[PDB]
């Protein structure tokens, strides 16, 4: 969030979006099999985790 | 070949003297370019088939030419190498030990070269030495030897740099100084600043044989644990490396001891402030901060290790409490007075402890226990281990996953940066990238903290960080060795702004950086982590070993070569709030959080609400400066309260007081109320109080009374001015180098002069100023130069002044010296002063000598708008804005009246009459009832130039002085019955009105003057002129004291018949005599002025006649071309003036004793503005006018002008090439708008000439008045229509009627017994050839014909029904002898026959004679018959203009001459051609046709040469020295062939001008400048029908 | 016609102003001069009205032209909508005493841009979201108030 | 290249106005009598105007061209070709009227 991908970010709000994505993906919860990579995909569908 | 053979017998070697008392050759230009020209000439002539004149001579001369080229090409390089290496081998000491083999080799080479120089000294002939055998071979051998020895010197320097890697930071000359001046270590001490990080001097033994220790610029001193002595280590590199190692070791030992001591303080709580201060004083600031960091980090780590299990008593709370206790102790300690070094250490400790607090307080107390946790691993953690024997391994700094070490390089004391979260992430990402062997590339808007953050990171790790600034501060020749040094010492690099480099520099340094980065990242290969063979890149074609410590940083605002090698971070928005809070807390301020929270938005508003000027700086640097100033103010208030703890002073008032005291001087008049509104918003209910300075104000008041100025206090008159003076004093106290900036017309100069007088009176310190104008003086002569061969240093003006002040002669420190730079600031010369304005306070001359100004000297600039100045110069010094609202009009009037009542004009009856006049005129100036109303009215009317208040009032004051002088003269003429009080009152009042009318709106059209007069009539009650249908401008205030019209003072003149329309014959008229009176008025006061008017409006004639009318005026006529330089004025002085040093100072006076020289300036606005919008000669003349002198470039001495007055004339600025004059120069010189003469004025001035010529034939004398009326009235209709908007050449002037009269007189000159219809037909012919051939449409021509017939009928009705004589109205003097009118067919046949003969005997293409060609031939013939007949052929190209001109010139026998213009044609060649044609026209009488094409005009200077050649008839700036002497001889001889006497040079020049007048016609062929349009007859040579 | 009073009463749009950030600053200064409050004691409070109520409270600054890109306003309570660019009529701008209280989880910081392209952050608005909605969804959907 | 091949028999020389040896090359070609190809005519040299105007002073069996000061013999078949490479340039009337 700070280095690497965060280095390119300039304003606060895209940094906030980057933080949101990073926390939603990079977590111990993602280890659970029924972890949604993206919720409400076309509404009814949801991307699961392999 | 004749010229080539004669010139080769006179060349001289031009021997000069050298510092080693030897001989040298000067003038490479003369001895190369002319020789190359001779080579070209011989090659061309032998190439050309007309070589059957000389065959063997040309080859001999050519081989001699090639021999000269070979010998001189070798000789110049040999001389340069010899002088440079002689300087190196003699000036530098210890050379006997430094490679003595090359010393003896150079001794032999120098012996041979000096033998050759003795030979060439005995024979100073160019070929006498060429004929000496063995010269060329010996010269080539010397060149080879010099090359070899120079290569040896270079390799020795490179070897020495390789020995000590830090020597790569210095240049070759400085390295030579270091390696040569081993005994004089004080010479080495100045170079230590560049090589090392912080040390500036090395503390040596008493006998200068043992290196006891080091120090720094600030004053911090480090004693070496083990001193190294130069005795047993004599080599410079050896003991320098030993000093470096000893510095590392001493730093390590002191760090270990300080850590041991700080463990005692950090054991628990209850820190004793007394012992804490002793510990701080004992250890260096770098070591103190390091010890605090190490203690805090190890304590937090131990506490976390304890907490790892869980809630184990929370020792983190204890660590936080200990940190809080230490912070409270430090906050208390800063409130008490401390030494500056201890203060800086204490502030660094406060900021670092604040960071250490914040970390634990917020990020760690959120339930963290693990010692391997990232949120603890994220922070920069210090680990000190003194067990390691190696110096560089004991201290280890680890950030995130990176594990750096601490290179123990002394950094002096550098200001630290508060660890903002932005700076925290910057450290994180830079450390992460450096771990991955990739340089960091932060980016963002400038002034956000990129370079400073990188430097702070480098200082944290102990790395020596080099900063390479971007703008104008790159030296690519040294960049390679800089990179080599960085890679060989493990230093850092931080480019301040990498994108500012232009493409070539950017690409080159980017390639170098790419190579460096690839070599660096080779150290972290996954399979080559263990580096066996050291990684080596390729710089300067050598394998430079790469040190892992080395790192490169670049900042954007990114190249493709470095995208894959550099990481980037955005620091666009810094954290101003936290920075301000921490800085205020470190300064002892209580409740710093609220103060920061208020101050940051205030500056953000100041970037928003206020206006936008370059000098404004609301950046982060300014905020920090304001904060430190506020800390100083708070400490000063605490100290003052003490002498009558005390933690009750209101902080907000202190903060706003610091803000105002720092910033208000830079504010404009409009912004100040806005600033106070913003203060009332952000800081409500808080008041700002000015410093009283009552001790200085009394002396200021006394000076103002004795300087006739007006003193004030607050809201009364002058309050703003005196406040500005006080702010100037404040800026003088704070810093050196301040510049006072404001619109021209404020009290800038007066402010500093008065304040210097006040300082001299009050403090008792004598103040001597040195006002220097740098624009007029050459920059090379401003600072100095080194001649290419001798390399002798001749100091410049400013250099000489600074050397005189620094030299222990007089007043080095007991007197305050104020170098005031008057003019405009621009990069060209402020480049040198950049190093003097900053904290370096040094002047590095090109010779190499470094000059530091003593503390008393203050380098002030006075400029007007500050728009072409580099931001570096502006930021390096403070400034105060002198708004135009400061200098109030009423205060101007008060100063004027006080000066008039005090200073006698003729420096008691004069003083009495002045006081009476002042008492009379008091109710007008001071009262805002007449003069102020008139001033604002004149400002809201239109004027030919921009209106400046100071000029418009200075002209008024000058005319009032003249009125007082007139009254004095009136009393002088009549001793009895003197000027009575009532007559005085009437005269002074009416003259005051008259002087307002001619000062205000005196440079505007007649309608504008009438509007001003009507407004005055509305706003005054004094006696106005009686007649209400005549402009007030027309009248004159008689010495009796009544309105008398100027027309009554207009006399009549009767010029002689042979002087009709003569070069210089002015006939008196209304405008002429009135402007003559005005010029006398201004010229009495020695006040320069310029007459501004349309071309050919009677400006030069009027002013020239006025000047020569005065008996004490000697006039020298100067022409100001575009390329006119101050050198022209200097030459005029050196020719017509003499320098004497007998007075207190050198004084320049005319050679003619008792004569007031005047340097008349043709087209004073013509000289072109330089690329910084300043005219060199204009600034030079302003320097002469204002300060009454200048500086001699020869000896840098102020010479004052005596009996020199400047008067000029110029066209309106709207015309092409007319750059408006500077406002500073404009206020000195009032201008008079000389408009085209009115109808009645033309009637009178030309009826004089009509009567004069018609007196020749008595019968026609009775028709003079109708002829004049018809001429002027026809010109009238021709002037309303056919304006310049329809056609650019449709301009009409009273010069056309002069040509008209001259032409009619020439026609009647040999003729006699003409009837009335004859005079009318000649008049009609001249009207047709002057007013109709210029037209471009047939409708215009028919309209002109109808008007000609109409005016002929209405003006004189007694002519026969024939229009003039017939329709064609033809004139030719070939058919008969006199200028008799001819018919159509006979003239056509004659012209056709002669044209057939012409193209048969000279040309090759047949010419057809159709109607247009015949008419144009007739016109050009008429032009050639009249001397000074100059023709303007406008028409399509290739239509026969040149051919027809040549044909008619051949018919009339005029020799044809034209310029052979090529691509590389220069001004000097054109002037030589002008000299040749003038010589053939003045002497050796020869009617010459000078046919110039539009393409022939290659430069505008040629057009100016034509402008001065045509109207005047001669070029004053063309004849110089030998040319003048030879032309004088030819003129004096040609005088006695034609029947005149030699007499004097002046009358012979007059006769030469007359001969050029009669024997030179210039014809201009142009394809479809207004000044060039006039003084030439315009012929619309239209395209073939 | 009215001097200072009308200069505040007018429902000036924010899209057309040349420097609308300067307008926000000027409004903040006006509210500060009112009651002599310090400039930093003021934070923007935004309520969306309708039908041009114009019930100004001597601190409300009715502004028009703001476009909510990505959701809708329901009595000042946001709600994600698939239909984008819902016009917001008369979003009243109020300034009140900042109590430095912790903002509840039902608030979001919406960046207010001028152009359709987002390259100029004029100011930020804190809206209350619906109960079911969450800040993460709003942040990722890209909602942002637009003046034009 | 078409002109180069066409007049290679006459040793046509390729040069440009930008070349500093342009005057020397012109003198050599004019004396010997060989065609010349001067490209880069945008920066036209006004020294060529006597040649373009065909001012032939056939005096005393010596046809000469007034090039600067030293007038050189006008050899027959002195064909100087002017050329350029850009199609957008507004030539001055002096050069335009003297060429096809
Ligand atoms: N009370 C006063 N204080 C200062 N100058 C005054 C005062 N009253 C009248 N003056 C006049 O105002 C002028 C101040 O201009 P000053 O000489 O200080 O400026 P400068 O640096 O020479 O030029 P400029 O300001 O036009 O660039 C002078 O002509 C001075 O006589
Ligand atoms: N009142 C006059 N009496 C006599 N001659 C006059 C008068 N007015 C104009 N002239 C004539 O008009 C001409 C003006 O002279 P001059 O060429 O010096 O003009 P100028 O205004 O100084 O020109 P420029 O602006 O080009 O320097 C002269 O020939 C002069 O004799
Ligand atoms: N985080 C910070 N804390 C304190 N001062 C800072 C900080 N960042 C920048 N500064 C100050 O700003 C001034 C200029 O910063 P600079 O490094 O020139 O920025 P830039 O790299 O954009 O030119 C420096 O004098 C520095 O003291
Ligand atoms: N009236 C004419 N009759 C025949 N040839 C003409 C005439 N006027 C011009 N020329 C031809 O034009 C050629 C060059 O004209 P030139 O004098 O250069 O025109 P310009 O002076 O307008 O450039 C000459 O060779 C001449 O033969």
Curated annotation (Swiss-Prot), chain B:
Residues 1054-1303 are annotated as: AAA 3. It is found in: Cytoplasm, Cytoskeleton. ATP binds at residues 444-451, 742-749, 1093-1100, 1435-1442. Residues 698-950 are annotated as: AAA 2. Residues 406-629 are annotated as: AAA 1. Residues 1397-1585 are annotated as: AAA 4. It is linked to Charcot-Marie-Tooth disease, axonal, type 2O: An axonal form of Charcot-Marie-Tooth disease, a disorder of the peripheral nervous system, characterized by progressive weakness and atrophy, initially of the peroneal muscles and later of the distal muscles of the arms. Charcot-Marie-Tooth disease is classified in two main groups on the basis of electrophysiologic properties and histopathology: primary peripheral demyelinating neuropathies (designated CMT1 when they are dominantly inherited) and primary peripheral axonal neuropathies (CMT2). Dynein heavy chains probably consist of an N-terminal stem (which binds cargo and interacts with other dynein components), and the head or motor domain. The motor contains six tandemly-linked AAA domains in the head, which form a ring. A stalk-like structure (formed by two of the coiled coil domains) protrudes between AAA 4 and AAA 5 and terminates in a microtubule-binding site. A seventh domain may also contribute to this ring; it is not clear whether the N-terminus or the C-terminus forms this extra domain. Belongs to the dynein heavy chain family. Homodimer. The cytoplasmic dynein 1 complex consists of two catalytic heavy chains (HCs) and a number of non-catalytic subunits presented by intermediate chains (ICs), light intermediate chains (LICs) and light chains (LCs); the composition seems to vary in respect to the IC, LIC and LC composition. The heavy chain homodimer serves as a scaffold for the probable homodimeric assembly of the respective non-catalytic subunits. The ICs and LICs bind directly to the HC dimer and dynein LCs assemble on the IC dimer. Interacts with DYNC1LI1; DYNC1LI1 and DYNC1LI2 bind mutually exclusive to DYNC1H1. Cytoplasmic dynein 1 acts as a motor for the intracellular retrograde motility of vesicles and organelles along microtubules. Dynein has ATPase activity; the force-producing power stroke is thought to occur on release of ADP. Plays a role in mitotic spindle assembly and metaphase plate congression. This is Cytoplasmic dynein 1 heavy chain 1. The gene is DYNC1H1.
């Amino acid at each position: 969030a700070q280095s690497i991908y965060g280095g390119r970010v300039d304003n606060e709000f895209d940094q906030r979006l980057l933080n949101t994505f990073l926390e939603r993906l990079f977590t111990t919860r993602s280890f659970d099999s029924e972890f949604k990579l993206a919720c409400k995909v076309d509404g009814h569908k949801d991307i699961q985790m392999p | 070949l004749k010229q080539i053979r004669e010139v080769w017998n006179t060349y001289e070697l031009d021997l000069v003297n050298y510092q080693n008392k030897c001989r040298l050759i000067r003038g490479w230009d003369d001895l190369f370019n002319k020789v190359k020209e001779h080579i070209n000439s011989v090659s061309a002539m032998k190439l050309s088939p007309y070589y059957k004149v000389f065959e063997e001579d040309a080859l001999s001369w050519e081989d001699k030419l090639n021999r000269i080229m070979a010998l001189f090409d070798v000789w110049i390089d040999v001389q340069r190498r010899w002088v440079y290496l002689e300087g190196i081998f003699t000036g530098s000491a210890d050379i006997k030990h430094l490679l003595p083999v090359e010393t003896q080799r150079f001794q032999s080479i120098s012996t041979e070269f000096l033998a050759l120089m003795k030979k060439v000294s005995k024979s100073p002939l160019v070929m006498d030495v060429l004929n000496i055998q063995g010269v060329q071979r010996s010269l080539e051998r010397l060149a080879d030897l010099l090359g070899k020895i120079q290569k040896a010197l270079g390799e020795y320097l490179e070897r020495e740099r390789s020995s000590f890697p830090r020597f790569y930071f210095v240049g070759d000359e400085d390295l030579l100084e270091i390696i040569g001046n081993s005994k004089n270590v004080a010479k080495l001490q100045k170079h230590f600043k560049k090589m090392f990080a912080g040390v500036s001097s090395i503390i040596l033994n008493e006998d200068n044989s043992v290196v006891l220790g080091i120090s720094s610029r600030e004053g911090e001193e480090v004693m070496f644990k083990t001193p190294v002595s130069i005795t047993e280590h004599p080599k410079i590199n050896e003991w320098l490396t030993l000093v470096e190692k000893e510095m590392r070791v001493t730093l390590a030992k002191l760090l270990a001891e300080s850590v041991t001591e700080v463990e005692i303080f950090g054991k628990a709580t209850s820190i004793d402030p007394n012992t804490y201060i002793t510990w701080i004083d004992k250890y260096q600031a770098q070591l103190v901060v390091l010890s605090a960091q190490i203690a805090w980090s190890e304590n937090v780590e131990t506490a976390l290790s304890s907490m790892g299990g869980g809630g184990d008593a929370a020792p983190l709370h204890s660590v936080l409490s200990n940190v809080e206790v230490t912070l409270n102790v430090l906050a208390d300690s800063v409130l008490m007075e401390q030494p500056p070094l201890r203060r800086r250490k204490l502030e660094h400790l406060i900021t670092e402890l604040v960071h250490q607090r914040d970390v634990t307080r917020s990020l760690i107390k959120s339930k963290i226990d693990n010692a391997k946790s990232f949120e603890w691993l994220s922070q920069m953690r210090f680990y000190f281990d003194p067990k390691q024997t190696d110096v560089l391994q004991q201290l280890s700094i680890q950030m995130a996953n990176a594990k750096f070490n601490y290179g123990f390089e002394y950094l002096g004391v550098q200001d630290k940066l508060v660890q903002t979260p932005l700076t925290d992430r910057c450290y994180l990402t830079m450390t992460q990238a450096l771990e991955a062997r990739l340089g960091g590339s932060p980016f963002g808007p400038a002034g956000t903290g990129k370079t400073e953050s990188v430097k702070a990171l480098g200082h944290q790790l102990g790395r020596f960080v080099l900063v390479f600034n971007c703008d104008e501060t790159f030296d690519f020749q040294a960049m390679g060795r800089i990179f080599v040094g960085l890679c060989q010492v493990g230093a850092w690099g931080c480019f301040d702004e990498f994108n500012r480099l232009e493409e070539r520099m950017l690409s080159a340094v980017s390639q170098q950086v790419q190579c460096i980065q690839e070599a660096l990242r080779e150290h972290s290969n996954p399979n080559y982590d263990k580096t066996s063979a050291p990684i080596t890149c390729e710089l300067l074609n050598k394998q430079v070993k790469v040190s892992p410590d080395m790192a490169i940083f670049i900042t954007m605002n990114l190249p493709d070569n470095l995208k894959k090698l550099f990481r980037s971070l955005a620091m666009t928005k810094p954290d101003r709030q936290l920075i301000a809070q921490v800085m205020l807390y470190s300064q002892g301020f209580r409740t710093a959080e609220v103060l920061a929270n208020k101050i940051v938005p205030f500056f953000k508003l100041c970037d928003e609400q206020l206006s936008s000027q370059s000098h404004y700086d609301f950046g982060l640097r300014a905020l920090k400066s304001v904060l430190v100033s506020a800390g100083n103010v708070k400490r000063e208030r605490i100290q003052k309260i003490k002498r009558e703890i005390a933690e009750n002073l209101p902080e907000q008032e202190i903060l706003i007081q610091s803000v105002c005291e720092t910033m208000v001087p830079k504010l404009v008049a409009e912004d100040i109320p806005l600033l106070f509104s913003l203060l009332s918003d952000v800081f409500p209910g808080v008041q700002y109080h000015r410093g009283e300075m009552t001790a200085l104000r009394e002396e200021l008041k006394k000076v103002c009374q004795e300087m006739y100025l007006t003193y004030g206090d607050g809201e009364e008159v002058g309050g703003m001015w005196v406040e500005k003076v006080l702010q100037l004093y404040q800026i003088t106290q704070i810093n050196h180098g301040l510049m006072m900036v404001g619109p021209s017309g404020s009290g800038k100069s007066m402010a500093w002069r008065v304040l210097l007088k006040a300082l001299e009176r009050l403090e008792g310190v004598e103040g001597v100023a040195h006002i220097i104008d740098p624009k007029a003086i050459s920059k090379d002569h401003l600072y100095g130069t080194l001649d290419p061969n001798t390399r002798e240093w001749t100091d410049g003006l400013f250099t000489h002044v600074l050397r005189k002040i620094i030299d222990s002669v007089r007043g080095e420190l007991q007197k305050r010296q104020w170098i005031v730079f008057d003019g405009d600031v621009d990069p060209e010369w402020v480049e040198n002063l950049n190093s003097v304005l900053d904290d370096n306070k040094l002047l590095t001359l090109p010779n190499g000598e470094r000059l530091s100004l003593p503390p008393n000297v203050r380098i002030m600039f006075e400029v007007q708008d500050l728009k072409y100045a580099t931001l570096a110069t502006v930021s390096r010094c403070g400034m105060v804005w002198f708004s135009e609202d400061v200098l109030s009009t009423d205060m101007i009037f008060n100063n004027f009246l006080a000066r008039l009542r005090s200073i006698p004009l003729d420096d008691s009856p004069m003083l009495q009459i002045q006081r009476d006049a002042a008492t009379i005129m008091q109710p007008y100036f001071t009262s805002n009832g007449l003069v102020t109303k008139a001033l604002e009215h004149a400002f809201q009317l239109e004027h030919i130039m921009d209106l400046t208040r100071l000029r418009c009032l200075g002209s008024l004051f000058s005319m009032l002085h003249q009125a007082c002088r007139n009254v004095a003269q009136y009393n002088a003429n009549h001793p009895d019955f003197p000027m009575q009080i009532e007559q005085l009152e009437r005269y002074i009042q009416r003259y005051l009105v008259y002087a307002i009318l001619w000062s205000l709106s005196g440079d505007s059209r007649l309608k504008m003057r009438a509007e001003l007069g009507e407004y005055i009539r509305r706003i005054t009650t004094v006696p106005l002129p009686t007649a209400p249908n005549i402009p007030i401008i027309d009248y004159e205030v008689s010495i009796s004291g009544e309105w008398s019209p100027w027309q009554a003072k207009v006399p009549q003149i009767e010029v002689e018949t042979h002087k009709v329309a003569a070069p210089d014959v002015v006939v008196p008229t209304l405008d002429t005599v009135r402007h003559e009176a005005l010029l006398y008025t201004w010229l009495a006061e020695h006040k320069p002025l310029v007459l501004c008017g349309p071309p050919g409006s009677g400006k030069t004639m009027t002013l020239f006649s006025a000047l020569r009318a005065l008996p004490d005026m000697e006039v020298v006529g100067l022409n100001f071309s575009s390329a006119t330089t101050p050198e022209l004025l200097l030459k005029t002085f050196d020719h017509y003036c003499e320098y004497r040093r007998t007075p207190n100072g050198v004084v320049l006076a005319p050679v003619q004793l008792g004569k007031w020289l005047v340097l008349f300036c043709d087209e004073i606005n013509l000289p072109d503005m330089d690329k910084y919008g300043t005219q060199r000669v204009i600034s030079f003349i302003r320097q002469m006018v204002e300060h009454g002198g200048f500086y001699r470039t020869s000896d840098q001495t102020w010479v004052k002008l005596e009996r020199i007055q400047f008067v000029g004339a110029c066209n309106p600025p709207t015309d092409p090439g007319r750059k408006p004059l500077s406002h500073r120069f404009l206020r000195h010189v009032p201008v008079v708008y000389v408009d085209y003469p009115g109808p009645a004025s033309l009637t009178q001035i030309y009826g004089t000439f009509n009567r004069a010529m018609l007196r020749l034939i008595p019968s026609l004398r009775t028709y003079a008045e109708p002829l004049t009326a018809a001429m002027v009235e026809f010109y009238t209709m021709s002037q309303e229509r056919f304006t310049q908007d329809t056609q650019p050449h449709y301009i009409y002037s009273p010069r056309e009627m002069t040509r008209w009269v001259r032409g009619i007189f020439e026609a009647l000159r040999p003729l006699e017994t003409l009837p009335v219809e004859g005079l009318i037909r000649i008049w009609a012919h001249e009207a047709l050839r002057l007013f109709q051939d210029r037209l471009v449409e047939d409708e215009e021509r028919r309209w002109t014909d109808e008007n000609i017939d109409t005016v002929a009928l209405k003006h004189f009705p007694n002519i026969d029904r024939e229009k003039a004589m017939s329709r064609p109205i033809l004139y030719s003097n070939w058919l008969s002898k006199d200028y008799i009118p001819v018919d159509q067919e006979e003239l056509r046949d004659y012209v056709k026959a002669r044209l057939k003969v012409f193209y048969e005997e000279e040309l090759d293409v047949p010419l057809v004679l159709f109607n247009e060609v015949l008419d144009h031939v007739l016109r050009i013939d008429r032009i050639f018959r009249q001397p000074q007949g100059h023709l303007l052929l406008i028409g399509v190209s290739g239509a026969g203009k040149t051919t027809l001109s040549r044909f008619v010139a051949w018919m009339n026998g005029l020799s044809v001459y034209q310029i052979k213009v090529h691509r590389k044609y220069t001004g000097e060649d054109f002037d030589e051609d002008l000299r040749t044609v003038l010589r053939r026209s003045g002497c050796k009488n020869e009617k010459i046709a000078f046919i110039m094409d539009e393409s022939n005009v290659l430069d505008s200077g040629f057009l100016e040469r034509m402008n001065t050649l045509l109207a005047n008839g001669e070029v004053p700036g063309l004849f110089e020295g030998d040319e003048y002497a030879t032309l004088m001889t030819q003129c004096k001889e040609g005088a006695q062939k034609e029947g005149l006497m030699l007499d004097s040079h002046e009358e012979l020049y007059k006769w030469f001008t007359s001969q050029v007048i009669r024997n030179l016609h210039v014809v201009f062929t142009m394809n479809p400048s207004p000044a060039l349009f006039n003084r030439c007859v315009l012929n619309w040579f239209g395209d073939w029908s | 016609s009215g001097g200072a009073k009308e200069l505040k009463n007018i429902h000036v749009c924010l899209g057309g102003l040349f420097v609308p950030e300067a307008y926000i600053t000027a409004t903040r200064q006006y509210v500060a001069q009112a009651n002599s409050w310090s400039l930093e004691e003021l934070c923007l409070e935004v309520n969306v009205t309708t039908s041009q109520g114009a019930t100004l409270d001597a601190c409300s600054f009715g502004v028009t032209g703001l476009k909510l890109q990505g959701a809708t306003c329901n009595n000042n309570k946001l709600s994600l909508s698939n239909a984008i660019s819902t016009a917001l009529p008369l979003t009243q701008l109020r300034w009140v005493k900042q109590t430095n209280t912790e903002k509840k989880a039902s608030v979001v910081t919406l960046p207010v841009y001028l152009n359709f392209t987002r390259a100029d952050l004029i100011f930020t608005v804190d809206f209350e979201i619906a109960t079911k909605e969450d800040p993460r969804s709003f942040y990722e959907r890209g909602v942002a108030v637009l003046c034009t | 290249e078409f002109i180069m091949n066409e007049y290679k028999d006459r040793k046509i020389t390729r040069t440009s106005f930008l070349d500093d040896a342009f005057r020397k090359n012109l003198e050599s070609a004019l004396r010997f009598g060989n065609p010349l190809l001067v490209q880069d005519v945008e920066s036209y040299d006004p020294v060529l105007n006597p040649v373009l105007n065909r001012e032939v002073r056939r005096t005393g069996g010596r046809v000469l061209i007034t090039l600067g000061d030293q007038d050189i013999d006008l050899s027959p078949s002195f064909v100087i070709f002017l050329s350029t490479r850009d199609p957008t340039v507004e030539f001055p009337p002096d050069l335009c009227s003297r060429v096809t």
